[PDB]
Amino acid sequence: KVFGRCELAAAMKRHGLDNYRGYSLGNWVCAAKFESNFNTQATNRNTDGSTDYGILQINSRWWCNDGRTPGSRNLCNIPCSALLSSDITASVNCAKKIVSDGNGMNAWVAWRNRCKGTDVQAWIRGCRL
């Protein structure tokens, strides 16, 4: 499923991401825009053999099980395919645990390079929340 901008902001707000651990809603929408282009089915392969899954591109090295990343852990206790659903609950819950492990949203390379320090507020401007 390819979300609309305001559609995904409303979905993330209902699932508790607005000001989660100090990050306004504009940060999460901005990260999803540049990590996945709002597409829940996005996958990308990393040079170490691991794969990023979903609208926030969560890594199989630490967070989910896909059965082909030997030596990895499964700290979100889910199969990686559950992160490709049109229902974003699984990806939101796993993202809450990631942003809490000390390093914040810096774990998302695209947020660091393209959203941090910008007016993230503009990503939710005009939406009914």
> Is 119 marked active-site?
no
Q: Are 55 and 35 in contact (CB under 8 A)?
A: yes
Burial category of 101 from C-beta neighbours within 10 Å (exposed 0-12, middle 13-18, buried 19 and up): exposed
Q: Quick one: which H or E segment has residue 9?
A: helix 5-14
101 is annotated as contributing to ligand binding = yes
Give, in order, the Cα–Cα distances in Å from 88 to each of 33, 52, 102, 123: 14, 15, 23, 19
- Choose the catalytic residue: 52, 66, 87, 119: 52
Q: Is the separation of the CB atoms in 40 and 3 below 8 Å?
A: yes
Binding-site residue numbers for substrate are: 101
Binding-site residue numbers are: 101
- Positions annotated as catalytic residues are 35, 52
